[PDB]
Design a protein around this ligand. Sequence first.
Ligand code: HEM
Ligand code: TCZ
Ligand code: K
Length: 405
Amino acid sequence: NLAPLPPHVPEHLVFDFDMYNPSNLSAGVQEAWAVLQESNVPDLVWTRCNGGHWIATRGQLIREAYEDYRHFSSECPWIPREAGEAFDFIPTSMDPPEQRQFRALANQVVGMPVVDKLENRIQELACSLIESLRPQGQCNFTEDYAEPFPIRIFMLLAGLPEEDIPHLKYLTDQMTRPDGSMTFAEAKEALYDYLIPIIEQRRQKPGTDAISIVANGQVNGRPITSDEAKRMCGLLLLGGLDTVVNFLSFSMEFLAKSPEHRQELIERPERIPAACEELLRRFSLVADGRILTSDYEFHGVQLKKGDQILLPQMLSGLDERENAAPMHVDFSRQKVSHTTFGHGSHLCLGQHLARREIIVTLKEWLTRIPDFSIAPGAQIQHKSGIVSGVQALPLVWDPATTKAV
Ligand code: HEM
Ligand SMILES: Clc1cc(Cl)cc(Cl)c1
Ligand SMILES: [K+]
């Protein structure tokens, strides 16, 4: 429950927020986290939960911390601390200057150029998936679309067989939202155990998949180690299975509950992209953090070398000091401001892939199923963690209102 308050942490700045089971969860994860932005909550608080750590509650501080990699190292980026210490993925667990040489190689496998080529294939699967669901007049969105659409595309980029999805997604989720069956340490080992034989195999018969490309790659000219490649592939895997999956569910849930918005995108299709950014702001869902390299006074607070601080990428865009009426989805919002894909040297390499997936989803679903709602009486539950998500989303619609392409 609560870790004893470190001697150096001010008693008045304690706000025991639990990132894996927030108080207000039933109001929605974002509303649960937004409690940290209420009227008398400080810019920086200390929660005694999960072993104890700082939490920056406003975008201005969240932004400076991410920019200041000398004081806030990504080396122990996960909470609780034990997870943070075993977290050795590349390049995420590294800080410039060493981080860069690997970030470039990772960028080559999932970046915009790679996305452009994946284009037609992504669209085909969105359609294949939506049309096949169309005439049923119902589906449980998380397992019938949110998960297979994103993951499949990733399993293809990685050139991995879909039969492995259940195992990999189980491991990934134990990392983002552990249910207790396994520790971060155990989850990563099993993921590292999965990859090893693949990395050695694609290192002898080099294919064109992302795995082969990282396995046979070079960092600023010298050869990548088998181990370096594993730590890098493991992260990509994490980034491919538990990001978009969850975000799509948040967006589609909001759309199921707001006909007005649906209609806006139906009547005015050119707004889909902007709506996509606005949805990313509103339904932001990642929160990881950093560890203090030395003792440092930050915004009037004494941080002690070794303290962990959670910098909720999720919170920036929900900050009223960044966007007025933040909880309000406005597809015409003139300055959509957020840090949903992060901030600093670790900006999300997969945002171009994520945006395309999101925008093709909106376009193709609204085209075939403009009217849909949450199943009657269904009580939607969110889940909080490093990546927040949706437990299930039952959707229903009248087949008669649909249109095949
Ligand atoms: C809605 C979708 C997504 C969101 C909100 C998101 C968010 C983030 C955030 C917040 C970070 C920064 C972590 C930090 O600073 O510790 C990050 C890093 C990263 N993400 Fe994304 N992500 C998404 C989708 C993806 C996808 C589809 C991939 C590709 C598999 C991916 C690959 C990566 C990589 C490789 C990094 C690490 C960059 C580095 O550490 O330099 N992400 N992402
Ligand atoms: Cl820590 C982390 C790492 C990746 Cl790859 C994606 C997200 Cl969302 C968080
Ligand atoms: K570590």
